[PDB]
């Protein structure tokens, strides 16, 4: 589990959106795993607006935030997992690292703030949805 808290808005793995999530939403992507809701308090997460391909990211799973090297974000084939089918997913980025399905929402940051989210794992990787296209994330 996990979120970035960003500005007003909440930015969740869509596949553990709340009925509150659904009901304040403000956009969301099945084909990203991403949902965005509206928050009542001001978050302290800052977007990473960069093309960065290193970072750290939180594992649940461990208890450990691990530095990792990242491809950049693509159109990717994920095998089945407990929360999806085998399918396409988009603006994925991978590492080689621990990923269980328990450690979606730990957050991956670079030196410019939040680069994105766990969403896959397996097989000696983790995948992170990438949020830093979302320039609308820093305004309104
Ligand atoms: N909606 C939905 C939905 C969620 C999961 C699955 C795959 N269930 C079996 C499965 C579990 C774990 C595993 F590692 C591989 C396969 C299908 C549809
Ligand atoms: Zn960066």
């Given at each position: 589990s996990?979120?970035?808290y960003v500005g007003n808005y909440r930015v969740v793995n869509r596949h553990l959106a709340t009925h509150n999530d659904?009901?304040?939403?403000?956009?969301?992507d099945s084909?990203?795993?991403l949902?965005?809701?509206?928050?009542?308090?001001?978050?302290?997460?800052?977007?990473?607006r960069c093309?960065?391909?290193?970072?750290?990211?939180?594992c649940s799973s461990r208890r450990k935030?691990?530095?990792?090297?990242?491809s950049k974000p693509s159109l990717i084939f994920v095998e089945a997992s407990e929360y999806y089918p085998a399918r396409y997913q988009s603006h994925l980025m991978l590492a080689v690292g621990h990923s269980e399905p328990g450690d979606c929402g730990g957050i991956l940051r670079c030196q410019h703030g939040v680069v994105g989210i766990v969403s896959?794992?397996?097989?000696?990787?983790?995948?992170?949805?990438?949020?830093?296209?979302?320039?609308?994330?820093?305004?309104?």
């Open positions: 996990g979120a970035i659904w009901a304040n939403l403000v956009w969301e084909s990203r795993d949902l965005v809701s509206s928050t009542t308090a001001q978050g302290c997460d800052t977007i990473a093309d960065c391909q290193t970072g750290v990211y939180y935030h691990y530095p990792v090297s990242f896959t794992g397996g097989n000696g990787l983790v995948g992170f949805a990438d949020v830093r296209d979302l320039l609308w994330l820093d305004e309104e």
